[model samples]
Target: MKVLLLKDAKEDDCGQDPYIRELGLYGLEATLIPVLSFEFLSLPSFSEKLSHPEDYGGLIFTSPRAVEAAELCLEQNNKTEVWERSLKEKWNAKSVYVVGNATASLVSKIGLDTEGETCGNAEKLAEYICSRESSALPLLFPCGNLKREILPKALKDKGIAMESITVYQTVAHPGIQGNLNSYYSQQGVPASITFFSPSGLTYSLKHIQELSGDNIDQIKFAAIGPTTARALAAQGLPVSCTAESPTPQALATGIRKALQ
Candidate 1:
């Protein structure tokens, strides 16, 4: 069966996306359709703040893009030596919070340890933060433009200070319509469509509707997890399946169950 995933593919050393590989194992053919793009912002200032880890209590990364921005800043400024020597150690003493495994893994690659990788989402990570640490210095959170208030608000409620910077902005993918239009004409309607984020759902909905036409309702809409699933239902859309977790196995299993 054909499954359209409105997300980008992450390449591993094996040269295939994990999602595609896992779904293929179950005899489901998956295709990725880019839905959202990003614009990183204020590198000079962000890099400066990042360089001085002593000034902040710790770091927080809610998205992989935020981690990428951190990596870019260090690489561009050529501060790998400083980070490896003492900068990483200082940050490691404090809580380096992250939402998902992807973000945590990228954070780890930058030479700092991560907490809250299992938290899965910002709202959950926010609670996890409150449980562990309250600090005199604010947590340094490098984030995205469309980031939810759940994490920030959670910290604020407990009188914990977190310094959040908008490291990037999520923008509509320039080729969304072109990619989607071509997919529809060539492949016909997919049996299922999966959304990875609320923003992605927002960006692609109009085009998906127009292209699917009368077959819109016939398409199964799966969310990567509860967060996107909530967004799907809030838009008066049906959620045919939701992955128990954000893993490829969970997603493929959920899709199999739904199709059954």
Candidate 2:
């Protein structure tokens, strides 16, 4: 069986490479298909507040994309100096968290210290932050505009004041149509299609109808998280699988089980 990865290729350690390599070791032919490219969105309006990172007791980053967006937002708005002077040395030393091991690795590689603390999901990260003893200490979440709101909602429910700023916006690239059509035309339709984000899935469905060829019902569907699964379901698509954990490994395992 062949598995296709629909994500940017440049974001080193997208969590797909290792999974693919491991699956190949087991004799599965897995391939990465770049479906979207991410472009940095301007968040200058949100930079002034980030200058006072000291006010935030901790931070949460879900993806390396978020890390890069936050850094770029700060740097372009003259707030890079603040990060360099205050948070650069011990960025992740004290209070920091990520959504998964892949993101944690990216954080550390990007110069943030990853020590005894890191998380694997939004709710878990929020819970970990709330568990901290600091009161009136804010948590800063720099992420994309269409992110799942469960973490911030959960944090707010716990009386832990947190604010999330959209440091980047994810847009679907124009090249997906040709590539998607080629895949479908050659493969004669995939057994299943797994998606990570609702926006990406939505974009693909709306624009890639040429590949569906009036036989959309034949394609099984899978999503990484409840939010994404719900979105696909709402669109009248049959969701064959939803990963227990919103990670590539978890999703791949879920896909295997679904196929069985």
Candidate 3:
């Protein structure tokens, strides 16, 4: 009944804690052992060409951090007033696109229009952009530094001028010194370990080996996305379950099926 939870540090509370609680509520004794630490990737020095938001037709956000950084960028540039005015008056005519419901919700909270499209990953988002007939509009993508390069590449392939800026980096936690690891070391291990991101997996495995002296064969792996699963494979690890929909609910379902 002891399940090992792995996730990046920025998502420590948002990603791992809630998931453990949910599993516990479902009769599984869950414990979190963080693997990767996350630090916001520093923004690159902006050029006059990039800072002029008017040049872009719209913005795309893949994470809450991206939305936050975009707002910060506007404030730092003394464009907050103009940006707020633009969003309010629809004067800027700048639209915002997000990857999923959570990101769309964050966009809506920022006082912009939001849509939930099936294009959840960066690749799909790029495809969605290309499918649109209006190729004249430029796009600004705010995301992590190490994420897949599909969106920007996809847009460029379609002849759409797009620029991408890394707003944050997902790093692993320094060590797994918490009580959760103690619980796993003492109690018997669970049937599987659920991983949400590659960063999370990298962080978790390093610490698990350090604290528990266990290897990949000790337990099954459950991955939430293709990128994460690929990371596991690269390490010669195996996945017991892979979620199709890269969401917490979908991952929870995947775990149940795998356990069955």
Candidate 4:
């Protein structure tokens, strides 16, 4: 069976390549096709948050893209030195919780340690934070504009103080429809198309609507987590399967199970 992943390619993170390789190990062919891209938000508040990491009790990252956005924001403000110092001194004393292994790994590269537990989804990450006991200092969440309210709401319900900053925005990739049209002209529709995030599913559905002769109902749809699954279901699409966690191995296993 052939699988198509609507996820971007990341050099250091376990992106589509690892998923494709893992699927190949299961005797499946997979293709990595990006249908969405990220645009970093360069807001003054983001710079202020980065400059004063001591104010927050901890940091939360759901996606590697958010981490990239934070770095970009710092560089754009010429606060790279402040970021490095904050990581070494103020932020180092605080917990850093992330959603996936890929994102947790990126946190280490930025000098802040992921001493807190890492989870597969925002809900689990919120539970991880709540388990640590509520504090007066708020948790700093740097995320995309399209981020769901599950994490923040969960934290607040548990009496955990939290603040969110929109560090990036999700956008539909340009020329994605044309590229997929070319692929369809050659190989036809894939047996399954996997969505990693809700924005990816939303943008993919929008672009798929523009392509001719492609019936979404005939294709199996896989989601990396419940949020993405809900997005697919909201669009009246059936979710074939959802990965147990947002990891390459879990996604590959989910796809295999869906096909089976």
Candidate 5:
């Protein structure tokens, strides 16, 4: 059976995508069609915010792109000195809230200890923050244009402070259609298709619908989390499974169950 993984190819230590390897164990052929593309929107301004760590209570990074935007800020503007200087330690003094292991590992490279790595989603992270923090200063959130409001709303409801800046914009991959067409032409409709984010589903849904056609229902749909699950629902797509955690193991478990 075949599976369509609608996300970028994140290579592991062996220079192979771990997801493909994991799915292969279940007798599934996983094909990755990169869905989301990012462009940094404001680095100079974001760098200025980064330089003044004292201005905020702590830092928040939910996605790898947010961390990448920070890396670019340091690398592009020669802000590495500021990063390696006392600034990194200054943020470490408070909090560096991250979502998944992918994001936590990147933030770890910036020399800050992160909390809520196991939360897997923003709502849980916000709850974790509210319990540990009551600081008046706002947490500096570097995010993408497609960032959901769950965290911000949760914080606001608890009377906690947080500030968000759109450091990067998430756009549809330019080759989404061509890639899907090629995948369909060669392999036919997959047994399952997984969506990583709402924007990915929104951008690729039309092509997916067109390619899958009558066999759309035959393909089990999967989501990375409840957020994407709801996105799929909003578009009237049935979600066959949702990964309990954003991990390769979680994905394989759901797909194995759904396919079985």
Candidate 6:
């Protein structure tokens, strides 16, 4: 079965193309076609917060892109070395929570230990943090412009003060439509197209329509989590399956089950 993933590849200790490689193990041919790109925002507030990392109670990371954006912010400010040292010395001692293991691994690469819970999704991470009774200090969330409000709102409802910093914005890739069109013309429709986020689904719908309006319903759709599944369903598209969690293994299993 051929599967199309609307996500960008990342390099880790396992090597590049981790998702594609993992899917291959499931006897599925997979291609990663990134429909969305990221643009880091240089907000003055982010710099102010970064300047005084001690002022915040903890750090929250929902996506690996946010980690990259924060690193870019440090690079832009020419404080990469200083921040690395801080993470190793002082920041490492703070409560650091991540939405997934991938983001947690990225945080570890920066020399800070993930002192708090690392869960599969934002909602669970928020609940875990709130249950820890560690809401005395404000939490700093560095995220993309399109980040969902569920996590932050959940924390606030429990009286946990949290500040969300827009460190990046999701944008449609320049060549996505053309590339998708070309792929469709050559390889035909895939067995399944999986979306990792709502932004990816939004950009994909535009390009898929441009390729051919009637072809939309012919392709199977899968989402990585409930949030993305809702986005797909809202568009009147039938979601074949949604991964139980936001992990490569879960996504692969969801696709395999859907295709079967």
Q: Best candidate, TM-score-wise?
A: 1
lDDT of 6: 0.78
lDDT of 2 by residue, 1-260 (tens): 65555554423465546645644654445555555676666567556655665677767788777777766777788877767777566445446777867677777765667752356677777777778665476777777765545777788877887778766666676677777877867776666677777777766776545677777776657787899899888888888888899665777777777766
Please give the lDDT score at residue 37 for candidate 4.
Answer: 67
The Cα local distance difference test for each model comes to: 0.85, 0.69, 0.66, 0.78, 0.87, 0.78
Q: In angstroms, what RMSD does candidate 4 have relative to the true structure?
A: 5.2
lDDT of 3 at 246: 70
Root-mean-square deviation (CA) per prediction: 4.3, 5.5, 5.1, 5.2, 4.6, 4.9
Instruction: Give the local distance difference test score of model 3.
Output: 0.66
For model 1, what is the alpha-carbon lDDT of residue 224? 96
Q: What is the lDDT of residue 239 in candidate 2?
A: 89
Provide TM-scores for the models: 0.70, 0.62, 0.66, 0.65, 0.69, 0.66
What TM value does model 3 have? 0.66
Off by more than 4 A, model 3:
8-19, 25-27, 42-51, 75-78, 86-92, 115-121, 133-137, 175-198, 214-260
Winner of 3 and 6 under lDDT: 6
Across residues 3-109, which tens digit of lDDT does each residue of candidate 1 receive? Answer: 98887544564888888788999899889877777789877678888778878988888888998998788778887777788777878898788787888888878
lDDT of 2: 0.69
Range of the 10 consecutive residues with the lowest summed lDDT in candidate 6: 7-16
Give the higher-TM-score candidate: 4 or 6.
6
Runs of candidate 2 exceeding 4 Å displacement: 1-32, 78-82, 86-94, 181-201, 206-260
Clashing pairs in 4: none
Clash totals, every prediction: 0, 0, 11, 0, 0, 0
| Deviation in Å, model 6, residue 230 alpha carbon | 8.6
> Mind giving the per-residue lDDT tens digits that candidate 4 earns over 1-260?
88888875433345436777888999888877777666777556787887787688888888888888777777788888867755456877787788877787788778887653358788777777778776588988888773455787898888999898877887788757777777767777888988888777666677665653457677889998999999989988899989999888899888888898
Q: Give a tens-digit lDDT track for model 6, residues 209-248.
A: 6775677677789998999999999988899999998888
